[PDB]
Chains A and B, each alone.
Chain A
Amino acid sequence: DGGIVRLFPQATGARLVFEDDKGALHLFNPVNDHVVAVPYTGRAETVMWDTSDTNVMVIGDGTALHSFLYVPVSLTGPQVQDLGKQAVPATHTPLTVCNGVVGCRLKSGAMDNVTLESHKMLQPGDAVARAAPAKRFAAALKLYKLRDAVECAKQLRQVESWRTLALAALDVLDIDTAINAYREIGDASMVLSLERVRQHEDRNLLSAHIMVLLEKDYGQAQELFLRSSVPRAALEMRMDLKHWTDALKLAEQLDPDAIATICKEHGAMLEMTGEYSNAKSHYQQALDALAVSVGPAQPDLEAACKAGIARTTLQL
């Protein structure tokens, strides 16, 4: 993107929000070599690091304390998220920041502390979010301090707040929120959706099977299976709940017997259905793609397709 104008390392340099030539700061994670451009752009005074968080990152330019939570692991990947663009006094030059509170320096030489709009909202001592901790639930669902939101939905005590934080953490791949919701009280059957998990580590086979069990998002599940240890699990869901939107996708590339399948139940959804014409066509090409299957020239399935061709020629 250009020359690195300013380098803002941590104490070890395992992550750093360096400045580009344009002036926009960019969080860098060289441990796994990931670059996330910070939503704050333009010249800053400095990137001082949160002593309470190596991922949450305050940009204090003398104008605002641009906090930036860094979320490296999700369904997609690393992301830098603004936890608040909260103003800073010009005389309060940011020396360091702790717990979302920037410890600045006075003009005569002293130490002064500058909080932000929502970090201190979730810190203890804010009795607005402690005597009435529903605001801590809300703002911890905002700043992804959701364990504060977890505890606060415990105290404000309903299932839907638990499920709200449960999905809000399932999006960022945290499940103990969902456990706290559902395994205390769930709808009907998500604990048998969790029980059907293998010892495979790619997160796309995993989530793809998870939403095969949820019987939803079968295009994304089949796509995640195409990047998985097995691609044919995509076609599996495709015969499991009778789709052709990607049964044909894996059938043209993997299995003419799956083409013969797709055309067998296409004849079927046109046999009992009627319009035995395209049912006849689909039954006939089901016989053909059974004959030209990469597997066997499967005689019993072809005979079933021929019973189909019997009835569909009969009604043709």
Chain B
Amino acid sequence: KFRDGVAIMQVAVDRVVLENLEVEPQRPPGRLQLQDMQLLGLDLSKGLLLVWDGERAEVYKVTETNDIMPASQFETTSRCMAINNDSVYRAAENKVEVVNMAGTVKQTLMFDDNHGSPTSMDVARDYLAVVTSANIVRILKVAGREAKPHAGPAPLCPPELKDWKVMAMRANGNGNLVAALVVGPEPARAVRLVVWCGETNTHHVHDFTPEGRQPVQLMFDTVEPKLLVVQCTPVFTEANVDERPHGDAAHVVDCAIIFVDPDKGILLQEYQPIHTGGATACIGSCAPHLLTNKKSMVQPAPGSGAFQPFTSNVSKAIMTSFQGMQDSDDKTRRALLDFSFNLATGNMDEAFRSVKAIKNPAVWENMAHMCIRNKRLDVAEHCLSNMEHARGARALREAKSIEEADARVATVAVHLGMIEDAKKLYIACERYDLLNQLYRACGQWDKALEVAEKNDRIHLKSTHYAYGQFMERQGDMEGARKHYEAAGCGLVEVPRMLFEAEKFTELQNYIQ
């Protein structure tokens, strides 16, 4: 988990690599050992990492140099818990034991047996989310000085997916929209996601196991709390071998980058790989990238046998549908994270209507510019192409050719280095013969002869006559003859007169 700016990871039974992302490379990273902690969860709050096993629970003091030592330890009256930075909501068997730094119950929050034992504990950084034994979750705001309920008690998972085994809860920043996987039962064991939208007390649905993976870590994106960046390793039942690669390499670990709509369930945007430096787990998501994991080791010092401290074992996986996002400003972040919410879910208010209809006086750097994936270019043409702004120009150059519908947008869609997106919508607008004959434009004019045959034998002769004149232009004579001859109407000149003049009949024209 990347929490509170500290991308803490646990790469061993006791080794907890509590890496603050701001640690200097010459400063030591997160190094911490547990005393054989049967860790059912850890809760770190900017220097107080509490780990618990079910018989003891120690809070670890951390310096800014990531020097992690136990500040305090206490027994557990119940296995799981969650800390309000001094006072730990414990997963008590009948309530929320808000136990103190020393493990004594400072405050009392209650969930009855209709809720069940409050076994799942999480403070969603302003909202203590308490999924109980029957998953009846009431979420507790802490924006004052202590806990106070925010989202009412309601089942985290629906009856059609409560029988599906509920594992944990990924409560959103507001502490109502709680993502929670449900794996299938013992005969099924297929992972579905129940994003408990506590805004409306509904239960979202996304069966990942047929849909591509079995996700391991769940987290919402740290910038937009509707972008559920679903870390996803491909694990399946014996019916879903589709996504996985062959045999032992069956984990093409790609994040289900997902903008969860609070109404229509989980709606997906893209499959973004974690595989960034041997990385198979996404531990966070910053603005420009996704904070994935990496191998945990100690870098050797350059030019010597010494060992420099590691910079960060946190690989920032660059996010791919967000083009012109990261080099650009933070109006890009709002505008086009909003547009990508309109991508996965499907909306129009955010990137366009919410910024037109408010009387907002400025001239932004990126009103919105990747918005062509919902087929609109003018937001990257008057914000950008009034002066052709460069840090959103990636999706602007995409954007002049994902307008491609053969409605004069083909011609704009083919200007310079950008016919490929015209071809992408040639596929999309059911004209992949134009995919073919304009993929011939990308420098494929040698086997464009046979792909032209695939298109038209009129296109065959167009490509052979152009290609025969192409090496006639380079200087070749006989090969010019052959591809002239291999053109059906290039053939009507070359055997006709002497086989030897397409260069020389071309020569007398300047004389004329």
Contact = CB atoms under 8 A, between A and B. Distances in A.
Which secondary structure characterizes the binding site on chain A? loop
25 contacts: A176-B473, A179-B473, A180-B474, A182-B443, A183-B443, A183-B445, A185-B443, A188-B417, A189-B414, A190-B416, A193-B415, A214-B415, A216-B416, A241-B385, A242-B382, A272-B355, A272-B379, A272-B382, A273-B363, A274-B359, A274-B362, A275-B360, A275-B362, A276-B359, A276-B361
Contacts of B420: 188
B415 A215 contact: yes
Nearest to A181: B443
Given A244-B386, A269-B363, 16 more contacts: A180-B474, A189-B418, A191-B441, A193-B415, A213-B416, A214-B415, A215-B415, A242-B385, A242-B386, A270-B363, A272-B355, A273-B363, A274-B355, A274-B358, A274-B362, A275-B360
A61 interface: no
B470 A179 contact: yes
A41 interface: no
Interface in A7-63: none
Contacts of B418: 188-189
A278 to B, nearest CB: 9
Interface string B374-403: 000001011101101000000000000000
Contact of B474 (A176, A214, A269, A273): A176
Nearest to A159: B443
Interface in A171-215: 176, 179-180, 182-193, 213-215
B367 interface: yes
Nearest to B445: A183
Interface of A: 176, 179-180, 182-193, 213-216, 240-244, 265, 268-277, 315
Interface of B: 352, 355-356, 358-364, 367, 379, 381-383, 385-386, 388, 412, 414-420, 438, 441-443, 445-446, 470, 473-474
A90 B284 CA distance: 79
B470 A188 contact: no
B254 to A, nearest CB: 27
Contacts of A243: 386
| Closest 9 pairs between A and B when the two form their complex, measured CB to CB | A274-B360, A185-B443, A275-B361, A189-B419, A315-B359, A272-B356, A186-B443, A269-B382, A188-B417
A149 to B, nearest CB: 14
A188 B419 contact: yes
B355 A184 contact: no
Contact of B361 (A185, A214, A269, A274): A274
Most buried by B among A182, A189, A274: A189
Contacts of B367: 272-273
Nearest to A215: B415
Nearest to A241: B385
Contact of B417 (A180, A187, A265): A187
A64 B446 CA distance: 49
Contacts of B381: 241-242
Nearest to B355: A272
A243 B384 CA distance: 11
Given A242-B381, A273-B364, A274-B362, A184 B416 contact: no
Nearest to B358: A274
Contacts of B419: 188-189, 192
